[PDB]
């Protein structure tokens, strides 16, 4: 691609002037939100709780696992990333990811 994940993370986390972490990351995915649109209270409304399997759009259309694990060129362009999370930041927590998250988001994620 264009990017590696550790390259995305890292700037991400110069941005936040902090490290990733993980767990947060993890935490964040999986909560339930309240501030963004109806259908989509949290990142596993589509993605799954367990990203090494498919997940599903809102009419039920197939979405490929996020575990780069189980799809191999996931995190390797930059601006899908920031593409892909500024749409969905959006639509379930309400407002863009920070810097912060995203760091801490990918960082579990790319283990996955
Ligand atoms: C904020 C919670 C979410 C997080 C952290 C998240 C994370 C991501 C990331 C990082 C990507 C880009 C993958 C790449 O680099 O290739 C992605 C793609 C995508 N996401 Fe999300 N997502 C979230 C919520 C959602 C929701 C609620 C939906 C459904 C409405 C959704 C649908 C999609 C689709 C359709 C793609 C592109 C398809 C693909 O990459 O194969 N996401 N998501």
Redesign the pocket.
Known sequence: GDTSPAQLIAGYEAAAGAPADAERGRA??LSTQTGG?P??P??????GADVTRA?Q??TGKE??P?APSA?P?????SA??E???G???N???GRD?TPGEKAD??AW?AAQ
Do not use: E, Q, Y
């Not at 060129?73 to 362009?77: E, Q």
């Open positions: 964040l995915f649109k259908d989509t949290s990142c596993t409304t589509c993605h997940g759009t809102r979405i490929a996020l799809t060129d996931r995190f390797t362009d899908r990333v593409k892909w999370l749409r969905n930041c639509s379930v927590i990811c988001l990918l994620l």
